[PDB]
């Protein structure tokens, strides 16, 4: 007779949390930013075209220099391109062809890879032999690896389908921190600008904000009706956007612990695969299954621009640190760079 | 023209990388990719052993053809998030144990293993990512079914069964019930083969099915329809 007591106590605590959230919502975001001038029409053109892939490209990440780019597809080879000259700087053969995530180290020395092999591979780029060697192989997960993000040259954050997140030490190869509490498979990660907190959305239509140095679940956000496939932190670290399969994106705040903005449209019935912000945080780029990407106004929830030119589902988006251009990778084995 | 010596050398390196990537792609595009599936204790391990962490790869060489089978065993997660990565395989091998016709799915929940296998089959068959991928069904463990038919009737899981306790018509009815789950019978073919614990003609049947699928694809893409 204790299980039902615990369940009713939990539901009472959830009702109290809901009441506390409702008692703090004075006005919506659409009422405070009503006097903000609209952005207008976003007209971006494809400047470069990176060819060479022969399979569906699943991941892509920009570096800290805003010049080099990394790309991963089902061919089983990482390709490091020079975005200014469209030249393939590096080609790294992989032991696993099913790659669904990749990461670029902030120093530019290491590259992460992962997929259905449940092992996170870290390869070193600057080697005295002039080639690429298998620097580290992190094992311990039983589900597919969905995202990879580097904190520094010694620590890495990974997410797997085991409803848990992990923080690994590169020098020791042991799981330093384990984040538990989710009920669905975590699909994406997002690091804070100060590398102190991180948000992770799962297939249970819910995201959780965790602390790195404590390993505890700080906050939890809900509101979606389908599985969340992408997530991205705000440039200032006080908000985050989530995209789900319900063709509706959401933008939550950290200090408010409530739903701040929602982006929906009747002519969109396709799920979201990638979500990213600009340098200023005014525009929100989201890739959908309608063979194109949509750039919405984060302050007015209006469609600011449409980026088309892909003949398949957009699988990954990327925005440089300085905000000079936006890279887009889809399953058509082609990478595009809009400016 | 307007590039320096280092820039020209970098362009040459990029061209060499492009050549290597194209060579690797042309070499890999000639191999056959098969997707292996099956429920628990359905004899998938026996099949992968006779024909020979996360996803397992298996390489076979038969009649100058290089088959690459993907075993997704021990991957207990939501398939709806990683099945689309297998869009484009040559065929889907699906292992089903007949002896599971009168056994529970590891729990006394009144759910027979045969019903769960039929549910998995009709879920992976009507999937949006495999609207034209052929399915090769392997019914394993018939050497035990031959004795289990004489100890337990088939009416335990199929109340509408109106036959006798013989292997031939029971296997035929099971094959018909498995094939009736395919809705799009025009753009999908289902190959059935009765396997046992000591069968050696599995690789030959797989090779024949792969050749048939290749012939059908060559008939389709060349415009002969």
């Amino acid at each position: 007779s204790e299980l039902d007591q615990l369940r009713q106590e939990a539901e009472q605590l959830k009702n109290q949390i809901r009441d506390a959230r409702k008692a703090c919502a004075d006005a919506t975001l659409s009422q405070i930013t009503n006097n903000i001038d609209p952005v207008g029409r976003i007209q971006m053109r494809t400047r470069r075209t990176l060819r060479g892939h022969l399979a569906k490209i699943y991941a892509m990440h920009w570096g800290t220099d805003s010049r080099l780019l990394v790309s991963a597809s089902q061919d089983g080879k990482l390709i490091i391109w020079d975005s200014y000259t469209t030249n393939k700087v590096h080609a790294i053969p992989l032991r696993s062809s099913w790659v669904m995530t990749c990461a670029y180290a902030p120093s530019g020395n290491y590259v992460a890879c992962g997929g259905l092999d449940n092992i996170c591979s870290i390869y070193n780029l600057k080697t005295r032999e002039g080639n690429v060697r298998v620097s580290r192989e992190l094992a311990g997960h039983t589900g597919y690896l969905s995202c990879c993000r580097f904190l520094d040259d010694n620590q890495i954050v990974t997410s797997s389908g085991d409803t848990t997140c992990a923080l690994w030490d590169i020098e020791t190869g042991q799981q330093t921190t384990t984040f538990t509490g989710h009920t669905g498979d975590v699909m994406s990660l997002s690091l804070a600008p100060d590398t102190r907190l991180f948000v992770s959305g799962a297939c249970d239509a819910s995201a959780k904000l965790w602390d790195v140095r404590e390993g505890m679940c700080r906050q939890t956000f809900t509101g979606h009706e389908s599985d969340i496939n992408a997530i991205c932190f705000f440039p200032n670290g006080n908000a985050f956007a989530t995209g789900s399969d319900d063709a509706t994106c959401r933008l939550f705040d950290l200090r408010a612990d409530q739903e701040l903005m929602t982006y929906s449209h009747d002519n969109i019935i396709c799920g979201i695969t990638s979500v990213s912000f600009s340098k200023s945080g005014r525009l929100l780029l989201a890739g959908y299954d309608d063979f194109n990407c949509n750039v919405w106004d984060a302050l007015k929830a209006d469609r600011a621009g449409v980026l088309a030119g892909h003949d398949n589902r957009v699988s990954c988006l990327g925005v440089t640190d300085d905000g000079m251009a936006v890279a887009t990778g889809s399953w058509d084995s082609f990478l595009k760079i809009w400016n | 023209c307007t590039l320096s010596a280092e820039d020209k050398a970098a362009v040459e390196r990029s061209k060499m990388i492009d050549r290597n990537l194209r060579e690797d792609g042309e070499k890999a595009a000639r191999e056959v990719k098969l997707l292996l599936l099956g429920a628990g204790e359905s004899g998938k391990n026996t099949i992968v052993k006779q024909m020979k962490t996360g996803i397992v790869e298996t390489h076979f060489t038969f009649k100058d053809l290089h088959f690459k089978m993907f075993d997704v065993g021990a991957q207990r997660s939501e398939r709806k998030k990683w099945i689309h990565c297998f869009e484009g395989v040559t065929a889907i091998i699906f292992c089903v144990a007949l002896s599971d016709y009168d056994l529970v799915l590891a729990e006394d929940e009144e759910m027979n293993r045969m019903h769960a296998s039929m549910k998995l089959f009709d879920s992976i068959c009507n999937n949006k990512w495999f609207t034209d991928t052929s399915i090769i069904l392997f019914l394993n463990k018939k050497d035990l079914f031959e004795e289990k038919i004489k100890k337990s009737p088939l009416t335990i899981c199929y109340p509408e069964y109106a036959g006798s306790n013989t292997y031939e018509e029971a296997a035929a009815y099971i094959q018909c019930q498995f094939e009736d789950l395919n809705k799009r019978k025009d753009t999908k073919e289902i190959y059935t083969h009765f396997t046992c614990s000591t069968d050696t003609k599995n690789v030959q049947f797989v090779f024949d099915a792969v050749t048939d699928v290749i012939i059908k694809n060559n008939l389709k893409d060349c415009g002969l329809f």
Epitope: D82, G108, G130 | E6, A9, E12, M16
Partner: single-chain antibody
Amino acid sequence: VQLVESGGGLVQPGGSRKLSCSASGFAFSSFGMHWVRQAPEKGLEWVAYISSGSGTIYYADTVKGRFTISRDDPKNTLFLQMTSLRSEDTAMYYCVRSIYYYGSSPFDFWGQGTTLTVSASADIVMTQATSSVPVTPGESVSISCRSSKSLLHSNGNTYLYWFLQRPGQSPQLLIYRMSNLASGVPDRFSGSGSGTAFTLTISRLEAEDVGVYYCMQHLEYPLTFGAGTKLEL
């Protein structure tokens, strides 16, 4: 990473000689190879260069037509055939490894070099004044360098290389790109400048940093080395 050369010795004038260089410790197929010559007058001079996969090969205007460089990839070897040897061929030959990509460090490893004795023009000109700089350890050193052509390319890069050669050893790369420290070199050395005027600054000088400092331009072939600035203890 190791390069070992062989095939030197004494040769009569007008004959021929086949020099060999073998590599060990790296992927030889992905690196370009340079053959450089050093006469007894302490002046460095580039002779030949071959890229990865033997695609593009460059020779010097003083040795074109007589020398032939070849690259055997399955054995990771570099051969150099030399016919019609003249009295000005008595020198030491070095093999240099050099890869070219964004962020790379070319000329990062120099071979041991073999000796060869023989008994008896829009090329950029690099000059180094003050051939002798006497200074005790502890004080800073400033080495100036000029050029006859602007090395600042349109891409914003400056193809200027600073090497150091110790007495009785092989030259070592100190600076590959302008204001960019190489690998294995301490942070005591620095380089700066612009246009056709550059400077190398050494702070907290030790006794182990004695040698000759050479400058090289890589804007266009052929590559020209400086006269050499000797650092006197």
